[PDB]
């Protein structure tokens, strides 16, 4: 076993709400996996009051 890991690169923050983030490195086959699942559950599960 010789796995790789990413290290959080930077937190590109324009504003409190509009935000951007770099991240690296990854072994290949994951950026889509990650982005997809995170996109799902961030947009689709966040408790608040409405």
């Amino acid at each position: 076993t010789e796995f790789l890991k990413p290290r959080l690169v930077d937190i590109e923050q324009v504003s409190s709400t509009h935000a951007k983030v770099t991240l690296e490195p990854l072994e290949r086959g994951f950026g889509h996996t990650l982005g997809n699942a995170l996109r799902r559950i961030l947009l689709s599960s966040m408790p608040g009051c409405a």
């Binding site: 699942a37 995170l38 559950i41 599960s45």
Partner: peptide, 13 residues
């Protein structure tokens, strides 16, 4: 990510 960590705690076992 923490939530899904907790989701996973049935099977790391």
């Amino acid at each position: 990510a923490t939530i899904l960590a907790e989701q996973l705690e049935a099977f790391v076992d």
